[PDB]
Design a protein around this ligand. Structure first.
Ligand SMILES: Nc1nc2c(ncn2[C@@H]2O[C@H](COP(=O)(O)OP(=O)(O)OP(=O)(O)O)[C@@H](O)[C@H]2O)c(=O)[nH]1
Lengths: 572, 468
């Protein structure tokens, strides 16, 4: 169909250009719809990562086209970043545009509560955006929301705040996670020394939370009593840990002391305690600790294995760690939980195993135990990962003698952990930190080295060990190809949500997580570097493939593991 | 992508249109005109590309007779030892761009674009072709608002696993927009998936795809489904109620809602939708005259811009009788203006240039003021720069008469007079050709008086709007 106007100037567009470019025509930004060229540029601008410094041209364009940008729910964040709050006329317009925008996604609404949005109408609005999220999503973000208190105006609490508190009084699951988060900040002595206004603020936050709960009904007061009971329980575990920690001797003597003390309800009141919601998981109601099963691990900090008696008479396992700062793991495991949720949002079930972590103090807390066998024991006892799987998930019809479904969970889970460990740059890649389950689930332990901190010379770029590759059947196996395909899928899916990850890390810049506190200004930036948003989709996949080749040929990785094994053998 | 054109001497690389893992699309110049080339890089030569090439040749033969269907005209297996290339005619605009390029499509143009999409699906089904990738990015629109569905990609995988969708980024998501116009039934449970690459498409599948494409047109460029909302649609976890509630036209909204239906048994045939909406979402004028008359211009026999103007001029009396009757009749005229305006920029003969002006003069009294100022006014000033002095004079005569008919000034043209009308003809008052200066002197008084009438109306409207 020959078209005569194929290569000719668009005369209708040129006409509107002459009238829209006229300085005599007063800015009618309400009816302005961007042309194709403006839309393509606008799409790039609305997609920028929060760390990218915006030029002046985007703010004037977005304002000029402010009535057009009102149809993008995700553009409210970019438009408001362009508005020059110093001009009251522009501010009145900026506040007027905000009220008409299509309500943005809650995932993006966390960005408006960061310290960067200081306008009280904007912050009361940001709370209005968070006000629409479901409690089930809020529980995934409460860790970040409480950190967001670092950016709020401390004076309104001493006198957005009402919104966060209002939801907790209705749902006990949120109240539990909120409560422990507020307690953790109220005990951080480092914050009291570095920012006494904030520490006193946190004292006010813990106090304010108590005041709001106090005004509730008897059932809410009962909720309060449970928190008071909760406080006594954690205090007992800390005292017990101190009594057990003071006992100089072999693991057996400490274990006997731990079990006897847990059993001695008359002195420790830990064998039989009042009904308390479990600190690690507020959805499970507990009656006490099982003394006979509490044991100390052979770690430098000797974690305690604790089995909690559930209301129904069941056993809920939890780990109490003393001597380690679990706040880093708490945030990270929250991030792992969030990464897992995003993949499932796209129906990409990577079979992630997000183990729960809860810091109960700046030095101790509860962590969920996931059934797994240490890789050091697996490698020492069975020789190869396939021998391990053949023993626990034998399937005559499955790949490599392992049930195809079990192998599928292993491949998906291995890929999921492999991608998340690349994204987070986990450094402490010792064989003690990888746990493998009989059902194929893979999870990481001991995140003592994160954000790229690696004491070893020439570390491999991605956590893919020769034993892990042999676990998938080798470079010639179908599962190894299925693993790689899932990695590309996950990389692209997470690349799409790099904005959410950078939004959450931005709220943690003022959170004294060891690897964040080392370079807080660069914390949000480090996550962006892992999203590699600068590469195209083709280059990113080419890069990921190159990454596997670069990681597989790193001969030096095997040498460092043997040296570490020799040092651990001498320490044991 | 441009590097692949170095081996094709009949195609000269022009611009890159997009790059994905599956297909890299670029525009090239050929002896026949502009062409879109999708280049598939052959990484594994053991792939049975001959089987796909034969399928594409079958598509060309099956779709050769469809007027609203554009199959791949050329498939090259070994165009280069590195890649196989597909060639098809280039269309001025894709539907994705057309929505944001001025003039903005009026209600009558929106109905016409929807009507042509349905006609393309109906024709493809009767011709034995199923699209399998019906999206707003594949429904092309020509300079005369003729819709051509292009990029028949029978090589794309038909079925995708629901549980492992990541494998769809190269098959379905080449453009990274996360827009999914695949029929819901084409996602299948991954326990089956771990010949769906080319499982025979049900007609109900294309109806689903057309509904998403038809929806994007009615949602101002707003996609109908995102991957999460669409997968949730198949699983019942998502429904694009917000976007569907965005279809302002109730008649167009009903048609769209039914076509993107998740259950194939509820999707009708393309011919049934045209019949169901005949006289409702699509006025009768589209079927009886617009489609048959307009089909002459989309035919293989090329009508030059000059010939098109003469053909329209010859039929002008019949067009007005068919569109206005003896007398909502203006609804059809918006579409009619598009045929003339698409030609004014390529007219070569003086006889045609005058004829084009005659058409504008006869149609001008029958168009809405918004259409007069937006679609007619810009072309007359273009003709005012024509090489024929008689044309420059007539352009001024035409512009003077057309503007005297403007009784209402659109909000976008309040300052059209001082910055576009008056400054646009100002160069005519000093033209080298005495006939032009004569036409200027003969009309300068009329142009000024017309602009003054406009200013008085704007002032009265502003006074009334201030008192509102
Ligand atoms: N203006 C214009 N745009 C075009 C033309 N050809 C393709 N495009 C656009 O450029 C992009 C090319 O990517 P496509 O592969 O066609 O995207 P798609 O239609 O979603 O994918 P398919 O269903 O496989 O065709 C799309 O936005 C097309 O709309 C053209 O001839 N003119």
């Amino acid at each position: 169909v020959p078209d005569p106007q194929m290569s000719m100037e668009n005369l209708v567009e040129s006409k509107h250009h002459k009238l829209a470019r006229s300085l005599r025509s007063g800015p009618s930004d309400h009816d302005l719809k961007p042309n194709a060229a403006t839309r393509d540029q606008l799409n790039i601008i609305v997609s920028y990562p929060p760390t990218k410094q915006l030029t002046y041209e985007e703010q004037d364009l977005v304002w000029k086209f402010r009535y057009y940008l009102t149809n993008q729910e995700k553009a409210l964040t970019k438009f408001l970043k362009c508005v020059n709050w110093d001009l009251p006329q522009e501010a009145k317009q900026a506040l007027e545009l905000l009220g008409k925008w299509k309500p943005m996604d809650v995932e993006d609404s966390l960005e408006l509560l960061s310290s960067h949005y200081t306008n009280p109408t904007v912050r009361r609005y940001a709370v209005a955006r968070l006000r629409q999220a479901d409690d089930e999503d809020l529980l995934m973000y409460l860790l970040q929301l409480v950190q967001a208190l670092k950016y709020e105006n401390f004076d309104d609490i001493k006198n957005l705040c009402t919104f966060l508190i209002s939801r907790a009084c209705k749902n006990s699951t949120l109240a539990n996670y909120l409560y422990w988060y507020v307690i953790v900040e109220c005990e951080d002595q480092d914050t009291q020394q570095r920012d006494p206004k904030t520490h006193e603020m946190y004292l006010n936050v813990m106090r304010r939370f108590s005041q709001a709960l106090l005004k509730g009904d008897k059932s809410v007061r009962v909720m309060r009593s449970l928190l008071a009971a909760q406080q006594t329980f954690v205090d007992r575990l800390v005292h017990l840990m101190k009594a057990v920690q003071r006992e100089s001797g072999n693991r057996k003597k400490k274990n006997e002391r731990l079990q006897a003390l847990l059993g001695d309800n008359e002195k420790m009141n830990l064998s039989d305690v009042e009904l308390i919601p479990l600190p690690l998981e507020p959805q499970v109601k507990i009656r006490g600790i099982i003394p006979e099963t509490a044991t100390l691990f052979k770690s430098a900090l000797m974690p305690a294995q604790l089995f909690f008696k559930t209301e129904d008479g069941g056993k809920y396992p939890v780990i109490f760690k003393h001597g380690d700062d679990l706040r880093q793991d708490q945030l990270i495991l929250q991030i792992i939980s969030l990464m897992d949720k995003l993949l499932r949002k796209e129906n990409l079930d990577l079979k992630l195993t997000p183990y729960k972590v809860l810091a109960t103090s700046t030095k101790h807390g509860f962590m969920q135990f996931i059934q797994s066998v240490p890789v050091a024991e697996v490698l020492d006892t069975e020789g190869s990962i396939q021998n391990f799987f053949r023993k626990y998930a034998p399937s005559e019809n499955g790949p490599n003698g392992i049930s195809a479904e079990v192998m599928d969970t292993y491949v998906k889970s291995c890929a999921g952990y492999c991608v998340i460990t690349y994204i987070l740059g986990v450094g402490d890649r010792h064989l003690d930190n990888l746990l493998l389950t009989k059902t194929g689930k893979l999870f990481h332990i001991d995140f003592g080295y994160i954000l790229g901190r690696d004491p070893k010379p020439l570390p491999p770029p991605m956590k893919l060990n020769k034993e892990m590759v042999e676990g998938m059947g080798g470079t010639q196996s179908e599962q190894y190809q299925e693993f790689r395909k899932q990695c590309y899928t996950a990389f692209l899916h997470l690349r799409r949500y790099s904005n959410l990850i950078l939004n959450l890390f931005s709220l943690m810049v003022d959170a004294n997580i060891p690897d964040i506190a080392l370079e807080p200004d660069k914390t949000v930036k480090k996550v962006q570097d892992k999203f590699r948003l600068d590469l195209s989709d083709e280059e990113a996949v080419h890069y990921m493939q190159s990454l596997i080749d670069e990681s597989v040929h790193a001969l030096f990785a095997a040498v460092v593991e043997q040296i570490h094994k020799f040092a651990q053998y001498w320490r044991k | 992508v441009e590097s692949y054109f170095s081996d094709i001497h009949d195609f000269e690389y022009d611009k890159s249109l997009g790059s994905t893992r599956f297909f890299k699309v670029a525009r090239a110049k050929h002896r026949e005109g502009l062409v879109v080339v999708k280049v598939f890089a052959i990484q594994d030569p053991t792939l049975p590309l001959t089987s796909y090439k034969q399928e594409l040749e079958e598509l060309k033969i099956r779709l050769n007779s469809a007027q609203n269907c554009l199959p791949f005209q050329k498939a090259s297996e070994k165009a280069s030892e590195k890649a196989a290339m597909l060639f098809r005619q280039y269309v001025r605009d894709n539907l994705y761009d057309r929505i944001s390029t001025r003039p903005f499509l009026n209600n009558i143009e929106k109905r016409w674009i929807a009507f042509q999409i349905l006609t393309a699906v109906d024709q493809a089904h009767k011709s034995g072709v199923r699209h399998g990738d019906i999206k707003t990015e594949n429904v092309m629109v020509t300079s005369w608002n003729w819709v051509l569905l292009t990029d028949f990609a029978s090589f794309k995988p038909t079925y995708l696993p629901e549980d492992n969708p990541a494998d769809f980024n190269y098959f379905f998501d080449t453009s990274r927009r996360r827009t999914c116009y695949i029929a819901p039934e084409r996602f299948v449970d991954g326990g089956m998936f771990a010949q769906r690459t080319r499982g025979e498409l049900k007609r109900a599948m294309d109806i689903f795809s057309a509904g998403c494409v038809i929806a994007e047109l009615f949602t101002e460029g707003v996609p109908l489904f995102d991957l999460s909302q669409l997968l949730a649609y198949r699983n019942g976890h998502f429904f694009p109620e917000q976007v569907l509630n965005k279809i302002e036209d109730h008649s167009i909204r009903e048609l769209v809602t039914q076509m993107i239906h998740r259950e194939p048994d509820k999707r009708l045939e393309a011919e049934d939708y045209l019949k169901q909406q005949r006289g409702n979402a699509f006025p009768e004028i589209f079927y009886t005259f617009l489609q048959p008359y307009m089909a002459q211009f989309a035919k293989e026999t090329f009508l030059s811009a000059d010939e098109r103007i003469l053909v329209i001029r010859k039929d002008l009396g019949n067009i007005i009788h068919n569109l206005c009757g003896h007398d909502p009749k203006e609804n059809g005229l918006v579409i009619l203006v598009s045929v003339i305006t698409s030609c004014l920029q390529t007219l070569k003969y003086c006889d045609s240039k005058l004829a084009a002006l005659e058409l504008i003069l006869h149609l001008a009294p029958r168009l809405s003021v918004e259409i007069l100022l937006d679609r007619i006014t810009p072309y007359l000033l273009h003709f005012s720069n024509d090489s024929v002095p008689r044309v420059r004079a007539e352009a001024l005569r035409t512009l003077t008469k057309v503007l005297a008919l403007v009784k209402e000034v659109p909000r976008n043209d309040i300052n059209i007079y001082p910055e576009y009308i008056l400054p646009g003809i100002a160069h005519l008052a000093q033209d080298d050709a005495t006939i032009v200066r004569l036409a200027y002197a003969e009309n300068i008084a009329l142009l000024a008086e017309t602009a003054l009438r406009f200013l008085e109306l704007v002032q009265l409207k502003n006074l009334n709007m201030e008192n509102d």
